[PDB]
Design a protein around this nucleic acid. Structure first.
Length: 250
RNA sequence: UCGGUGUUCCCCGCGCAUCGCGGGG
C-alpha cells in the first residue's frame, strides 16, 4: 500500500542508469531481498503453488508434496518487487512498496548516496516521496507514458503491437490491484488506447549470474485511459530494475 | 517518457495440460 521513493536528481551532464546503480549497490552488503532475490531459495522471487488441486501432480512430479512457501512468498504471493531501482535519463532512485521493504531502503540509503555522489560529483539533488497506491476510474481519458516497457515475449514491430501492449498494461494493473487489495474500475471505463509503441527493439537479458543469450522486447509507450493512478505503477517485466514505469503526463 | 534493435542462464504460476498463455531476476 504505502510507497517511499528515494530520488536523486542527476546533474545536467551525468547519467547513471538504474542498472548501474543496482550493480554498484550489489558491491555493498545489502540483503538479497533488496535485489528481489528470495533469501530462502537463492533464486529470484517467484510464486508458490496457488491451486491446491496441483498437489497430486506435484507429488508424482517430485516424489513429495510441495514445501511451505518462503516468508517472502507468503508475504508476496504474486512476486511483485517490493524494491525497485528506478529512474529516467534525468534521475535515479529506489522505490520501496510496502512497510515490509522500507528497512531495505533504509539500509541502502547511505550506500546509494555514496554511489550517486561519487559517480556524478557535486550537484546531486535528493527527495523522499511518500505515496499510497490508488486506482480510480475517470470520466475522461488521462494521458500516460510507459518508460522502457519490457515484454519478455510477444513484442513485435508490426502495428498490432499497440494492442499487444494494451493487454499487457491491463494485466499489469490487475496484477497490482490484486496484490494490494485495490478495486479495479471496469475495463469498459478504463478504455485503454495505446496511442504509440515507440522504437520496438531488443535488449539482452543480463542477470546476477551474468549476461544471457535471451533478448527481450523493449519499447516506449504513449497511451490514454480513464484512470487516476496514485503512487508508482508498472507494466511489463523486469520492473525491479525500473523497466515499465507508468508516467502520468502533466 | 522515448540509452541497449531482438529470445532462454536458471527459477516459477495458471490452464481445455509432451501443449498453450503468463510470472521472477
Amino acid at each position: 500500500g504505502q510507497q517511499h521513493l528515494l530520488r536523486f536528481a542527476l546533474p545536467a551532464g551525468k547519467k547513471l542508469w538504474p542498472n548501474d546503480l543496482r550493480e554498484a549497490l550489489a558491491k555493498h552488503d545489502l540483503p538479497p531481498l533488496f535485489f528481489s532475490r528470495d533469501p530462502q531459495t537463492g533464486h529470484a522471487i517467484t510464486r508458490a503453488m496457488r491451486n491446491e488441486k496441483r498437489v497430486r501432480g506435484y507429488i508424482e512430479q517430485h516424489g513429495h508434496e510441495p514445501p511451505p512457501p518462503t516468508e517472502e512468498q507468503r508475504a508476496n504471493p504474486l512476486a511483485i518487487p517490493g524494491i525497485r531501482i528506478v529512474g529516467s535519463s534525468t534521475w535515479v532512485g529506489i522505490l520501496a512498496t510496502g512497510e515490509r521493504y522500507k528497512p531495505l531502503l533504509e539500509a541502502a540509503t547511505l550506500p546509494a548516496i555514496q554511489i550517486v555522489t561519487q559517480r556524478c560529483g557535486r550537484g546531486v539533488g535528493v527527495e523522499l516521496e511518500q505515496h499510497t497506491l490508488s486506482i480510480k476510474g475517470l470520466d475522461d481519458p488521462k494521458r500516460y507514458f510507459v518508460r522502457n516497457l519490457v515484454m519478455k515475449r510477444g513484442l513485435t514491430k508490426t502495428a498490432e503491437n499497440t494492442t499487444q501492449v494494451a493487454s499487457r498494461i491491463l494485466s499489469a494493473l490487475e496484477r497490482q490491484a490484486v496484490a494490494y487489495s485495490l478495486d479495479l474500475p471496469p475495463t469498459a471505463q478504463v478504455d485503454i488506447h495505446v496511442e504509440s509503441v515507440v522504437r520496438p527493439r531488443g535488449m539482452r537479458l543480463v542477470t546476477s549470474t551474468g549476461a544471457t543469450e535471451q533478448f527481450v522486447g523493449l519499447a516506449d509507450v504513449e497511451f490514454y485511459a480513464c484512470l487516476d493512478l496514485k503512487g508508482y505503477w508498472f507494466a511489463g517485466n523486469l520492473t525491479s530494475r525500473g523497466y515499465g514505469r507508468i508516467i502520468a503526463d502533466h
